[PDB]
Amino acid sequence: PNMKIIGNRIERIRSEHAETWFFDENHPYRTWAYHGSYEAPLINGVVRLLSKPWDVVTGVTGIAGQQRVFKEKVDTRVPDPQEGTRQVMSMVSSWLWKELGKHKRPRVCTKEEFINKVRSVNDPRFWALVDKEREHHLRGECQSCVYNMMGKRRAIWYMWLGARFLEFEALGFLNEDHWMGRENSGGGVEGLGLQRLGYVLEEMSRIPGGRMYADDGWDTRISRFDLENEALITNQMEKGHRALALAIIKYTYQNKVVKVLRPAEKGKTVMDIISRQDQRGSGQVVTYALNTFTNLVVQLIRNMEAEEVLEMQDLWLLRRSEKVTNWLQSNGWDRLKRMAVSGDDCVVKPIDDRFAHALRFLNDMGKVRKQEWKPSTGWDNWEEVPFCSHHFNKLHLKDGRSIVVPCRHQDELIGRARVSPGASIRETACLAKSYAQMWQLLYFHRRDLRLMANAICSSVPVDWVPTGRTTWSIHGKGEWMTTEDMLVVWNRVWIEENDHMEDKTPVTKWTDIPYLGKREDLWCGSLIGHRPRTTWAENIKNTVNMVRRIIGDEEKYMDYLS
Ligand SMILES: [Zn+2]
Ligand SMILES: [Zn+2]
Numbered sequence: 001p002n003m004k005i006i007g008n009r010i011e012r013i014r015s016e017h018a019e020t021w022f023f024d025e026n027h028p029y030r031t032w033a034y035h036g037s038y039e040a041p042l043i044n045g046v047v048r049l050l051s052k053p054w055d056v057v058t059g060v061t062g063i064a065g066q067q068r069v070f071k072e073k074v075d076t077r078v079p080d081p082q083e084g085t086r087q088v089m090s091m092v093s094s095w096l097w098k099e100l101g102k103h104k105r106p107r108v109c110t111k112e113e114f115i116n117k118v119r120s121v122n123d124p125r126f127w128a129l130v131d132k133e134r135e136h137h138l139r140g141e142c143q144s145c146v147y148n149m150m151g152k153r154r155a156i157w158y159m160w161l162g163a164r165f166l167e168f169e170a171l172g173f174l175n176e177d178h179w180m181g182r183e184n185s186g187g188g189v190e191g192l193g194l195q196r197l198g199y200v201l202e203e204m205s206r207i208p209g210g211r212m213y214a215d216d217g218w219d220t221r222i223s224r225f226d227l228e229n230e231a232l233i234t235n236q237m238e239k240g241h242r243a244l245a246l247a248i249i250k251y252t253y254q255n256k257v258v259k260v261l262r263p264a265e266k267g268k269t270v271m272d273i274i275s276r277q278d279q280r281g282s283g284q285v286v287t288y289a290l291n292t293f294t295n296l297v298v299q300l301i302r303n304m305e306a307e308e309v310l311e312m313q314d315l316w317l318l319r320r321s322e323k324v325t326n327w328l329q330s331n332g333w334d335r336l337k338r339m340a341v342s343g344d345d346c347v348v349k350p351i352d353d354r355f356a357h358a359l360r361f362l363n364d365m366g367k368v369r370k371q372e373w374k375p376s377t378g379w380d381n382w383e384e385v386p387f388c389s390h391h392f393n394k395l396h397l398k399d400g401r402s403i404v405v406p407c408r409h410q411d412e413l414i415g416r417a418r419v420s421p422g423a424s425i426r427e428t429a430c431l432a433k434s435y436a437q438m439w440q441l442l443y444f445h446r447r448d449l450r451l452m453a454n455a456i457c458s459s460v461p462v463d464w465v466p467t468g469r470t471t472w473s474i475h476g477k478g479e480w481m482t483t484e485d486m487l488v489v490w491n492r493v494w495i496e497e498n499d500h501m502e503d504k505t506p507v508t509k510w511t512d513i514p515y516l517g518k519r520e521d522l523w524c525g526s527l528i529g530h531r532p533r534t535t536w537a538e539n540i541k542n543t544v545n546m547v548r549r550i551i552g553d554e555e556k557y558m559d560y561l562s
Helices: 001-017 045-049 065-075 083-100 113-118 126-140 162-171 194-205 224-236 240-252 288-307 322-337 353-357 360-364 410-417 427-444 447-457 486-496 518-523 531-551
Strands: 033-040 147-152 157-158 257-263 267-278 338-341 345-348 389-396 402-407
Touching: 001 033, 001 224, 001 240, 001 257, 001 267, 033 083, 045 427, 045 447, 045 531, 065 147, 065 157, 065 257, 083 224, 083 288, 083 322, 083 360, 113 162, 126 162, 126 240, 147 288, 162 240, 162 345, 162 389, 194 224, 194 338, 194 389, 194 402, 194 427, 224 240, 224 288, 224 402, 240 257, 288 353, 322 338, 345 486, 410 427, 447 531
Parallel strands: 147 257
Antiparallel strands: 033 267, 147 157, 257 267, 338 345, 389 402
16 A cells, blocks of 8 residues: 555544544455454335236346455455556557547536536535645645445445545546547447447447457456556646646545445444555446446457457567557557447457457456456347347337337346335335336337336326436436426437438327337246236226325326326
């Protein structure tokens, strides 16, 4: 640990818990530096009532401790890549940042931009704390950019709103100005809705070359070298902005301080203060953009190895750099356009199948696939390629026009809709309406979801505005968060604004909108034809009437089932 960089944050924590602070010599940390400890102190009813057949489906109910996740997934370490691998990583990262910044200029994001963003802070004492920490950063110090780690048995790293603002201020431009958008990056998909991703995969399937590869703990494999290469963006910044960004990179990214809970004696709990120089601090403002960046660099490197630009001699030391520069200048852009990269999620269409066994740089970089030396298996059919937890299928409207829709196992969709965050009928009903409308826009092709969504919408007052979050994904554009008629919204998304729908004829009725074939719907978890589901569908109007009774029969409801 670099005590000159992390000491101030450790001292601040100790000062807030001076009387309970202690050093636990029997702490369980092996690859994280340990500094000390101190003493430390649901179901959406509306959706559950309307999804009785899924009460007995573990795939659904299972979706509804921290130390275990830490020891197994976060408390690990791997060797440094060799010198040549590190030179290649730096050269490709420098080239990529220059390409991304050719038609964009870095900028400081404003206090006002952050305020308008949170309405999806009003106290001036918060901004006084924010200004104070900023002043420490400009002097070369950090007092409060500390993570609170929350394990889900993956690891979620939380930081106070002030630290997130300082990060947004210095690096938010990457998101706000769409540096990782497809137009700017070739391989990125930032800003695209789930409704567009299938068309990207289909376009890639037509590029001549090998099979489509979609090889998947990414955040734990980000090295200190990846972090340094990500930091090369500061070279494109003007002095003032650069000072703010270098401080975020130093304290939030490269010299992290984390608070983690641990069980103690006789039902009590302790908080541990630990530190780590590498790995990604999951859930930060630009985590997604930086993961996309580094994943693009990794895929370009894998393509250079596959194409025999990089030889086995180059892992140890890269003697000549000209071959790499010539490949990047000649082919870099063509290779980026053969990718779809969304953070840690990637699909690649290489020029041939040598990519499958191009594993020497990949493994030396510590970017191990989810056997280490077994060649990757590519996909011949783009409709089966996994991307962002979905696969994408071509269906046809009643009039014959094709559409490409997103799909995933239905248990995941229903399981997520049954989760309600925080301990009222108003809030649960408005959140159920958000899920139902999301399903009408994107998963209309699933029989059980079209019916369940219509039952939910028929059970919630028509004038109640959808609220809450139905997804964390950047590909969730929230078009369903509205009281506008969902057939109108469906037409806007799938016909009007869909650049892959040549004929702009509107669709006038839901019956013209297809379902998957029965075989595919069943493969992806449909309970169609299963007796408890048949009973649920036959009884659905009575179930809707029961929910209307609970919410209030005085409210105005619409029958979306009729
Ligand atoms: Zn700080
Ligand atoms: Zn499917």
